[PDB]
Amino acid sequence: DPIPAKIYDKNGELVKTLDNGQRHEHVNLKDVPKSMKDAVLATEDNRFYEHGALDYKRLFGSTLTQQVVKDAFLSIGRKAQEAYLSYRLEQEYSKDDIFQVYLNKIYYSDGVTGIKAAAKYYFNKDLKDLNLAEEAYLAGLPQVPNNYNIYDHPKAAEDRKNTVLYLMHYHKRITDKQWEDAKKIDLKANLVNRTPEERQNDSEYNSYVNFVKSELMNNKAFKDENLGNVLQSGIKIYTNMDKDVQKTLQNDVDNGSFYKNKDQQVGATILDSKTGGLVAISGGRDFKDVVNRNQATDPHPTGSSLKPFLAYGPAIENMKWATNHAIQDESSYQVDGSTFRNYDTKSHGTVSIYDALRQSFNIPALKAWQSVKQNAGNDAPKKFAAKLGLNYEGDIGPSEVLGGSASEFSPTQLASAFAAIANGGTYNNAHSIQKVVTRDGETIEYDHTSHKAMSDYTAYMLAEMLKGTFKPYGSAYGHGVSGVNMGAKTGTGTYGAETYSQYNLPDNAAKDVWINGFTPQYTMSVWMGFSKVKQYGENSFVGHSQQEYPQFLYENVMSKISSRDGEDFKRPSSVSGSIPSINVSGSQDNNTTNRSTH
Numbered sequence: 225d226p227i228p229a230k231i232y233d234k235n236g237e238l239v240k241t242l243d244n245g246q247r248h249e250h251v252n253l254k255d256v257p258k259s260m261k262d263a264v265l266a267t268e269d270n271r272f273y274e275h276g277a278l279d280y281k282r283l284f285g286s287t288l289t290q291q292v293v294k295d296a297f298l299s300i301g302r303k304a305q306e307a308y309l310s311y312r313l314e315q316e317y318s319k320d321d322i323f324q325v326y327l328n329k330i331y332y333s334d335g336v337t338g339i340k341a342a343a344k345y346y347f348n349k350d351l352k353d354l355n356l357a358e359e360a361y362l363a364g365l366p367q368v369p370n371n372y373n374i375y376d377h378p379k380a381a382e383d384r385k386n387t388v389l390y391l392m393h394y395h396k397r398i399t400d401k402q403w404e405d406a407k408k409i410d411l412k413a414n415l416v417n418r419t420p421e422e423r424q425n426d427s428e429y430n431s432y433v434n435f436v437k438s439e440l441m442n443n444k445a446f447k448d449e450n451l452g453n454v455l456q457s458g459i460k461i462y463t464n465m466d467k468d469v470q471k472t473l474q475n476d477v478d479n480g481s482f483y484k485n486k487d488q489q490v491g492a493t494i495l496d497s498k499t500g501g502l503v504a505i506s507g508g509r510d511f512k513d514v515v516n517r518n519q520a521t522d523p524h525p526t527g528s529s530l531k532p533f534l535a536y537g538p539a540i541e542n543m544k545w546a547t548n549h550a551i552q553d554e555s556s557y558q559v560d561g562s563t564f565r566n567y568d569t570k571s572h573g574t575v576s577i578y579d580a581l582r583q584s585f586n587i588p589a590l591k592a593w594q595s596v597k598q599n600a601g602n603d604a605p606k607k608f609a610a611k612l613g614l615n616y617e618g619d620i621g622p623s624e625v626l627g628g629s630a631s632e633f634s635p636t637q638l639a640s641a642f643a644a645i646a647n648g649g650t651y652n653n654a655h656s657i658q659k660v661v662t663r664d665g666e667t668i669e670y671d672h673t674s675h676k677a678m679s680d681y682t683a684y685m686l687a688e689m690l691k692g693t694f695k696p697y698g699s700a701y702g703h704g705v706s707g708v709n710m711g712a713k714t715g716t717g718t719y720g721a722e723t724y725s726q727y728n729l730p731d732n733a734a735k736d737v738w739i740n741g742f743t744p745q746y747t748m749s750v751w752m753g754f755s756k757v758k759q760y761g762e763n764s765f766v767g768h769s770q771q772e773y774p775q776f777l778y779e780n781v782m783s784k785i786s787s788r789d790g791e792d793f794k795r796p797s798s799v800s801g802s803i804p805s806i807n808v809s810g811s812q813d814n815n816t817t818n819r820s821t822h
Contacts, residue, residue, distance in 0.1 A: 225296060226329075226337075226456055226458075227457070227458030228241050228243050228455075228456070228458070229241070229455045229456070229457075229458070229459055229461060230242075230458075230459075230460050230461065231429070231433060231436060231461050231463060232461065232463065233463060233466065233467045234463065234464050234465055234466055234467075234501075234503075235467070236462065237467065239465065240426060240429045240433055242433070244335060244424055244425060245335035245452065245455065245456065246335065246337075247334070247335055247337075247344075247345050248328075248336065248337045248338050248341045249338060249340040249341035249344060250328055250338065250340065251324075251327060251339065251340035252324070253324040255351070256327060256339070256340075256351055257351050259356065259359055260339065260351055260359050260362070260363070261323070261327075262392065262397045262398075263359045263360055263362070263363035263392060263397075264288075264326070264327070264339075265288075265397075266363070266388070266391045266392040266394075266395045266397045267360075267363045267364050267387075267388045267392070268286070268287075268288055268291065268326075268363075268366075268367075269286065269288045269291075270391075270395050272287065272288045272289075277289055277290075277307070277310045277314040278290070278307060278310070287310070288322060288323060289310045289313060289314055289322050290306055290310050291326060292310075292313070292322060292325050292329065292330070293306050293309045293310045293313060294306050295330060295331070295453065296329075296457075297309065298449065299448065327339045327340070330366045331366065331369050331450070331453060332345075332362070332365055332366055332369060333365065333369035333370060333372075333373040333452065334375070334423050335452065339351065342365070343358070345416065346358075346362070346374070346416060347415065347416060348414070348416050349414065354414075355406075355409060355414075356389075356398070356402065356405070356406040356409065357385060357389070357406045357407070357409035358409075358411065360385050360388035361374075361381060361384065361385035361388065364384040364385060364387060364388040365381075365384065367384075369450075370450075372384045374411070374412065374415060375423060378412065381411070382411055385411055386407060389403060389406055389407055420512065420514060421512065421515055423514070423515075424512065424513065424514060424515065427510075428470055428471045428474040428475065429465075429470060429474075430474075430507070430511050430512065430513055431474065431505045431506045431507035431508075431511050431518060431520060432463070432465055432470055432502070432504065432505050432656070433513060434507060434511070434518050435502065435505050435507075435518070435520070435521065435636075435656050436463060436656045437451070438521070439656050439657055439670075440454070440461065440657060440660070441454070443668065445668050457663060458663045459661065459662055459663065460662075461657060462657070462658040462659050462661070463502070463656045463657055463658060464496065464499070464502055464503060464656060464658060465502070465503065466503045466504055466785075468785070469494060469504040469746075469781075469785045470503075470504040470505075472504075472784050473492055473504045473505070473506050473781055474504075474511075476777060476780050476781050476784075477490055477492060477506045477508075477509055477777065478509050478510055480776065480777055480780070481776075482773040482774075482776040482777060483509070483773070484765075484773075485763070487754045487755045487756060487763050488752060488753075488755075488763075488773075489508050489519050489752065489753055489754065489755060490506065490509060490519060490751065490752050490774070490777065491506070491507065491518075491519035491520040491522070491524070491635040491751045491752075492504075492520055492748065492749070492751075492777065493505050493634075493635045493636040493638075493639040493654065493748070494639070494746055494747070494748045494785075495639045495640065495643050495654055495747045495748075496745070496746065497643045497647050497742055497743065497744060497746055497747045498643075498646075498647050498744075498745075500640060500643060500651075500652020500653060500655060500672060500674065501652075501654075501656070502654050502656040503746065505520045505521075505636070505656075506520055507519050507520045508520075519635075520634065520635050520636055521634045521635075521636050522634055523632035523634055523637075524632055524633075524634075524717075524751050524753060525627055525628060525631060525632055525717040525735065525736045526627040526631045526632065526633055526638065526715050527626075527627035527714075527718075527734075527736055527737070527738055528584040528586070528589070528626065528627055528713075528714070528715050528716060528717075529627060529638060529713055529714070529738045529740055530609070530614070530624075530625070530627055530631055530715075531581060531584065531589045531625075532581070532642075532690065532713055533608060533609045533612055533614060533641060534605045534609055534624070534625045535589040535590070535592040535596065535605075536577055536580075536581050536589065536592055536686070536689070537678065537682065537686060538593075538596040538600065538604050538605050538607075538608040538609075539577075539593075539595060539596045540681075540682050540685050540686070541608060541678055541679060542596060542599065542600035542604055543596070543600060544807075544808040544811040544813075545577070545813055546801070546805065546806060546807035546808070546812065546813035546816055547576070547578045547685055547688065547804055547805065547807070548576040548578055548804045548805045548816045548817060548818065549576065549577045549813050549816055550575065550576060550577075550817035550819070551574070551575055551580060551588040552574055552575075553566075553571050553572045553573055553574070553575050553580070553585055553587050553588050554571045555569065555570060557587045557590060557591075559590060559594075560621070560622070562622070564586060564587065564590060564622060564626070565586065566585050566587055567584070567586065567716065567718075572585060572821060573819075574817055574819055575588055575817070575819065575821065576804055576816070576817050576819060576820070577592065577689075578689050578692055578803070578804040579692070579820065579821040581689050581690070581692075581693075581713070582689065582690065582692035582693045582697075582699065583697055583699055583821060586626055589625065589626070590622055590625060593622070593625045605620055605625075608677075608678070609641075611651055611675070611676075611678065612640065612641035612651050612677045613637055613640050613653060614633060614641055616630055617630065618630065627717050635738075635749040635751045636654050637654075638738070638740050638749045639654060639747050639748065640653055640654045640747075642713070642740045642742050642749065643742060644677045644683065645678075645683050645686045645687050645690070645742060646683075646687065646743070646744065646747050647683070647744075647793075648680050648683050648684075648793075648794060648796075649676060649677055649678035649679060649680055649682055650674065650675070650676055650677065651675055651676070651677035652672060652673070652674050653672045653673035653674070654672070655671075655672035657670045658670060679798070680796035680798055680799075681796050681798040681799045681808050683793075684794070684795055684796055684799050684806075685799060685806050685808075686711075687711050687742075687793040688711070688793070688803050688806055689711070689803070689804075690713050691709070691710070691711040692711075692803065692804065693711065693713060693714065694710065694711075694712060697821055697822050699713075699714040700712050700714050700741075700775050700778075703739075703772075703775040703778060704741075705782050705783045705786055706788075708743055708782070708786045708787075709743060709744060709790070709791065709792045709793065710741055710742060710743040710782065710786070711741070711742060711793075712740060712741035712742065712778070713739075713741075714737075714738060714740070714775070715736065715738030715739070715740070715751075716734050716736075716737055716738075716765075716771050717734060717736035717737070717738075718733075718735065719733060719734075719757070719764070723757065727757055727759050727761075728759055728760050728761075729760070729761045730761045730766055732766050732767045733764040733765070733766050734765040734766075734770075734771050735753060735754075735757070735764060735765075736751060736752070736753045737751070737752050737753070737771045737772075737774050738750065738751050738752075738774060739774045739775050739778045741778055741782060743782070743786055743791075744791040744794075745786060745787060745791065748778060748781065748782060750774040752765075752773055752774045797809070800812075805818070
């Protein structure tokens with residue numbers, strides 16, 4: 225029975241409580257229009273006054289009672305406890321009592337329970353003065369409230385409304401005429417005008433709540449149910465959220481000055497590097513839960529973010545390369561019937577992969593990816609990446625290596641992948657919920673996916689190389705935090721070659737920009753893009769200067785929240801040497817250089 229859900233941070237403190245979900249107006253059964261009740265019955269349980277608790281004719285050659293119960297407490301036979309409670313309920317209360325409870329407690333979407341409020345909401349009408357088509361729709365809505373809500377699926381909502389009208393005619397609850405009359409009414413006519421904002425009506429938690437709501441139904445114990453039905457059963461949700469970090473991340477996102485215009489978007493995820501627990505998340509600026517796409521959990525092109533996982537990572541793992549392993553760079557380069565060049569269009573000659581990664585050269589990463597493909601097998605890259613949650617439906621071409629094509633993942637996904645590097649090479653699928661405590665007192669334990677993604681040396685060597693990103697000439701030089709030990713990998717994702725012309729985009733125009741940083745404590749992943757590609761690059765990142773934006777967000781937040789205790793990534797006894805010249809013990813590298821970049 226009705227009671228809002230409560231969300232608790234990492235300290236057990238109450239952080240948020242989901243209200244706004246009470247547009248409910250109580251109605252007495254005498255005060256409900258005959259035609260409204262006729263509508264309900266005709267569609268849900270026509271012979272409700274007859275059949276008693278279960279409908280045995282239906283069953284052989286549902287029921288209002290059953291609905292009321294299913295709604296309240298709720299895999300193979302837990303349908304039988306419904307049956308039994310329905311029986312009991314049918315023994316305690318009369319048909320009028322039950323019919324009334326139905327009309328007062330069933331969910332109508334957008335946080336509406338009860339036909340009385342469901343009418344005042346969708347149509348601003350009293351039950352008395354609302355029309356036939358409006359009744360039919362309000363009668364069919366409750367079945368699957370999310371798919372029938374007009375505001376979201378007007379086509380479905382009209383089909384549902386027509387089905388009810390049919391049923392009503394078929395059960396001869398309305399004449400042949402009034403049927404025909406009603407299917408002429410415009411349903412939308414009196415439809416109260418709202419935008420996604422009013423439909424909902426301490427915001428630093430919005431993105432986190434949005435995230436928890438999604439993960440909550442992924443557990444076996446709730447997977448079947450509904451949103452507006454599992455959140456009203458007074459459960460208590462305990463999360464890994466850091467109250468403080470979450471506020472910081474969302475404030476800095478909302479009040480940051482690193483937005484070129486109003487079409488620019490962000491997505492930020494912050495995990496506990498070690499555990500994988502979601503410490504804070506932001507889906508965008510001034511993010512409204514259902515109103516806005518949660519950009520922290522939606523996929524975007526990754527640009528050069530994935531190099532550690534498709535090229536150098538699998539290369540250090542599978543053929544034990546040293547960090548100063550040497551690759552021959554060029555100006556152009558062939559892979560299939562396609563040419564590839566570096567972003568700066570140059571060739572840097574011979575380069576240590578330490579630099580090749582921290583400055584994100586494209587050819588050397590293609591070479592490396594190709595070397596992993598030969599010396600470890602064509603599926604070696606896929607396997608490595610797949611350990612870190614980065615899956616690929618089909619083939620991994622040179623494009624996905626460079627972040628194009630199928631290389632689309634959420635900031636949350638990348639944060640998880642990178643946190644692996646940040647903690648000895650153990651992968652932890654991002655997880656916000658610790659446990660939920662049900663109204664009575666039961667404790668459901670949630671768990672997440674965890675498992676070795678890479679061997680200790682690989683993780684340490686990546687962690688060490690990527691520290692070089694914040695060092696001079698590094699793709700994120702100047703944006704690292706001072707006393708803090710952190711490595712990072714930036715991503716810059718270009719546009720399709722055709723779209724450069726269609727929109728007259730300048731040469732240095734980028735569509736997605738990422739930074740993925742990690743300390744021993746936190747891993748943080750930031751993506752930024754624009755909602756619509758405009759002409760001349762107005763909605764693109766143009767030049768290092770503009771593509772550098774997410775690094776301001778990263779630096780700001782990582783500086784406020786990171787602790788200066790001087791912790792570092794733990795060095796395995798399996799690595800020998802020091803940056804930029806780290807190798808795998810007892811397996812030094814045939815091919816190396818002491819050659820620097822600039």
